[PDB]
């Protein structure tokens, strides 16, 4: 994170920061903190590009899609890794499956708290659906319509 | 001998092993996991003084082992000791690898290697009860195949029956054995070569060792226990065999 942050904050070479993040995720595809930071960097890069477009046009959903594909592969590899860390029988495997799903979707709630905000939460809950967590999700739906 | 007799334990010349003197003398190793005989042998028990405990010793049968046969015939040097690391090639089961593990004790380790899987299951159960052993259920001619499990073992023992005995010993001992490290081979003449005689087989295999840079120190034949068998003790030199 620190080398990527120095590179993007002082010299601002977004391609270099991208390659740094991809290498770091190749080494540690287990760390939700590093996944979180990659998503945050991509979001900041998108907002900077948007504001540069705004000031350019002022003088004279692809982005959400890439952040959300990063979220999708985040959920895939985090599920795989929380399973493989402590790989048994029917009840044991089923209980472990419930615990893994609980952990993954608590992390996605943290992604929501990190959070076209409406479109972002919309596609997150779309991937989610595709008990109490279901209630919290439909609560998120109602509060999104409030927002 | 019987179910109630009383004996006097005594330290042998080699450390780790003991003699049980009575009306007939019994080779003995200190039992590590006490209360369960592995291959059904009788076992001695002393009581030692906190409240005292019951320590247990285990008899070593030389009509079953091919290392207690060497001990009883009298080997001047055996490189297995109370604190070392021993690589055991051809470890069929506890019937010898458990006694070797009781000799090296809780400080040292023993890596047992077997190919076939039913003795593998026996080895897995016995190694679960005994922590000094790590088991490998893989072919012993492929140290590259199991290189991630072994680091710089200190002696090698060989109970391999296959006729490539000297080459498989040379491979494992170049890979893992330490310098100036003890090699102990149990040669079976009938398995190595059936047509020619046992002495010819023995001279031939000591020649193969000396070619593969193991300097043989001694050679015993262990005659009242097995026929046509031999134990060669050598030292792995790697630097100036002369």
């Amino acid at each position: 994170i620190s080398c990527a942050k120095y590179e993007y904050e002082v010299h601002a070479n977004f391609k270099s920061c991208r390659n740094i993040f991809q290498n770091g995720l190749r080494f540690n595809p287990d760390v939700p903190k590093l996944w979180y930071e990659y998503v945050k960097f991509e979001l900041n890069f998108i907002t900077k590009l948007i504001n540069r477009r705004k000031v350019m046009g002022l003088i004279n959903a692809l982005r959400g899609d890439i952040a959300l594909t990063i979220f999708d592969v985040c959920m895939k590899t985090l599920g795989k890794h929380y399973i493989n860390k402590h790989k048994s029988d029917s009840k044991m495997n089923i209980e472990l499956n419930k615990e893994t799903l609980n952990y993954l979707f608590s992390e996605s709630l943290r992604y929501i708290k990190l959070f076209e905000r409406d479109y972002l939460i919309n596609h997150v809950l779309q991937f989610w659906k595709n008990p109490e967590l279901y209630l919290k999700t439909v609560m998120i739906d109602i509060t999104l319509n409030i927002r | 001998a019987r179910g109630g007799a009383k004996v006097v334990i005594e330290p042998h010349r080699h450390a780790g092993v003991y003699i049980a003197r009575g009306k007939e003398d019994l080779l003995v190793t200190k039992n590590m996991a006490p209360g369960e005989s592995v291959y059904g042998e009788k076992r001695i028990s002393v009581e030692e003084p906190v409240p005292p405990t019951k320590v247990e010793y285990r008899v070593w049968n030389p009509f079953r082992s091919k290392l207690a046969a060497g001990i009883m015939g009298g080997l001047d040097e055996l490189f297995i000791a109370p604190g070392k690391k021993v690589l055991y090639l051809g470890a069929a089961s506890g019937t010898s690898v458990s006694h070797v593990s009781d000799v090296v004790g809780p400080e040292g380790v023993v890596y047992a290697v077997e190919f076939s899987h039913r003795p593998g299951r026996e080895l897995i159960s016995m190694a679960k009860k005994r922590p000094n052993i790590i088991p490998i259920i893989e072919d012993a001619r492929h140290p590259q195949k199991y290189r991630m499990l072994i680091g710089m073992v200190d002696c090698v023992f060989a109970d391999v029956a296959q006729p490539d005995q000297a080459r498989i010993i040379a491979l494992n001992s170049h890979m893992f054995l330490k310098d100036q490290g003890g090699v102990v081979i149990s040669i079976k003449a009938n398995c190595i070569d059936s047509t020619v005689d046992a002495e010819t087989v023995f001279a031939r295999e000591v020649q193969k060792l000396r070619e593969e840079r193991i300097k043989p120190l001694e050679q015993l034949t262990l005659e009242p226990y097995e026929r046509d068998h031999c134990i060669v003790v050598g030292r792995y030199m790697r630097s100036g065999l002369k």
Binding site: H86, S88, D89, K91, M92, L96 | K128, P131
Partner: protein, 255 residues
Amino acid sequence: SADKVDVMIIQAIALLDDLDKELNTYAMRCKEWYGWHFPELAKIVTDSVAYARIILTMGIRSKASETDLSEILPEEIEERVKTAAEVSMGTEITQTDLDNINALAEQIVEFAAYREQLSNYLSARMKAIAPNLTQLVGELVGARLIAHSGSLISLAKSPASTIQILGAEKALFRALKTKHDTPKYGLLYHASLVGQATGKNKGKIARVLAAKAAVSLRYDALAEDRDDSGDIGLESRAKVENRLSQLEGRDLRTT
């Protein structure tokens, strides 16, 4: 009075000894099962009650690496168990087996709590029956002396040197018939004053404490208007404490 039941004392101390023995053997068997699954916990934590509470806390190496065990173990031993659970050599269990192991650990915890409850009950019983001997030598040693001698009356009838010797009868009679030197402590070794003395002072304090214990015993077994506040025992402890402190202040070497 309804509370003066030395039969309840001797039954309680016999139950205490058997309870300790059986709790020990059941703890060993529980260590055997959960060492068949977890072969490092036995060499990490030898406290059998801690073993049972750890088994009640987690039932698998992942729950060992996730849940918190602060009230059971210190933090360094806790993280050491966590790394051992990360790399454990033993197999994994099925659910009915984990049920039975959990029930066995609950049995161990219940027996430990029952032993503590019974020990406190016996202590209050001694403070109700022979409070002066309780103030002198302690509840455990008082119950052991009463249990050895049978009844409080027989223990009061015995002289003081017998109350000193009372435990070491094997070595006593062997030395007597062999013409050797007789043992000097007896059962009074585990009283606190003999636990504070050092060597020849342990011998002399065993003698003085035995004399004062015989005084207290003859008071309590034969009192008609017993105060049940133990002032005789308090003053005997005062005299023994003063004697011991003076005998420790007395020095052997040169200055």
